[PDB]
Ligand binder design. Structure first.
Ligand code: MYR
Ligand code: CA
Ligand code: CA
Ligand code: CA
Ligand code: CA
Lengths: 142, 6
């Protein structure tokens, strides 16, 4: 089921959202992350999102709720995946390179060794060309 | 870090 390495990855991803590290993700923090990813949600849109994952309805997202949400890997939109792919593939060539992934990690404020970026690319790469194309990007989250 | 879903 949910591996322990996934719980490790999701706990790290959670720290990327929870800027102050107070253990909760707020609309403000969700707003800065989304804007760092080239998005631009409104206060209400941001609040709507927290709601779609705020199990106890307290307004903020805790790791349990975030882990729960991630658990919903059972999902799989070709325009929702498409926008995600686009934030990574900055030069728009159809391939996410290690350098592009690094750039998004940077905007997200995550420090990773080149080896670590190669590894992430590695686990998503299927054909072995050392890059991630749309087809491999999709499978990476469905 | 290491992986994601299947
Ligand atoms: C390994 O070091 C953990 C990987 C962390 C990647 C964080 C990405 C989470 C933010 C989502 C951005 C993708 C756009 C839908
Ligand atoms: Ca927080
Ligand atoms: Ca909550
Ligand atoms: Ca590219
Ligand atoms: Ca590839």
């Amino acid at each position: 089921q949910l591996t322990e390495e996934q719980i490790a990855e999701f706990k790290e991803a959670f720290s990327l959202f929870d800027k102050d590290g107070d253990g909760t993700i707020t609309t403000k923090e969700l707003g800065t992350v989304m804007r760092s990813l080239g998005q631009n949600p409104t206060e209400a849109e941001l609040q709507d999102m927290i709601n779609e994952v705020d199990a106890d309805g307290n307004g903020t997202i805790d790791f349990p709720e975030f882990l729960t949400m991630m658990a919903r890997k059972m999902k799989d939109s070709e325009e929702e995946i498409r926008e995600a792919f686009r934030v990574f593939d900055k030069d728009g060539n159809g391939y996410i390179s290690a350098a592009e992934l690094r750039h998004v990690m940077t905007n997200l404020g995550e420090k990773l060794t080149d080896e670590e970026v190669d590894e992430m690319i590695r686990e998503a790469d299927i054909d072995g060309d050392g890059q991630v194309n749309y087809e491999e990007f999709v499978q990476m989250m469905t | 870090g290491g992986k994601l879903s299947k």
